[PDB]
UniProtKB/Swiss-Prot annotation:
Residues 1-51 form the Kazal-like domain. The lineage of its organism: Eukaryota, Metazoa, Chordata, Craniata, Vertebrata. It comes from Meleagris gallopavo (Wild turkey). GO terms for molecular function: molecular function inhibitor activity; serine-type endopeptidase inhibitor activity. This is Ovomucoid. It comes from the Eukaryota. Keywords: Disulfide bond, Glycoprotein, Protease inhibitor, Repeat, Secreted, Serine protease inhibitor. Its main location: secreted. It is found in: Secreted. Disulfide bonds join C3-C33, C11-C30, C19-C51.
Length: 51
């Protein structure tokens, strides 16, 4: 997924789960993309929805 607009200093509370390649269910795209940046691009998206 496109994380170009990230990192962002805050994420909203909109709960739209997505499952990272680490088997964490991130709360929304903002939280996931911030983690992708934090990971130096090693985290990817497994699927939308809960792991
Ligand atoms: Cl459910």
């Amino acid at each position: 997924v496109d994380c170009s607009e990230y990192p962002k200093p805050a994420c909203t509370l909109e709960y739209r789960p997505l499952c990272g390649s680490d088997n964490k269910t991130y709360g929304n795209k903002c939280n996931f993309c911030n983690a992708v940046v934090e990971s130096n691009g090693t985290l990817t998206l497994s699927h939308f929805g809960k792991c």
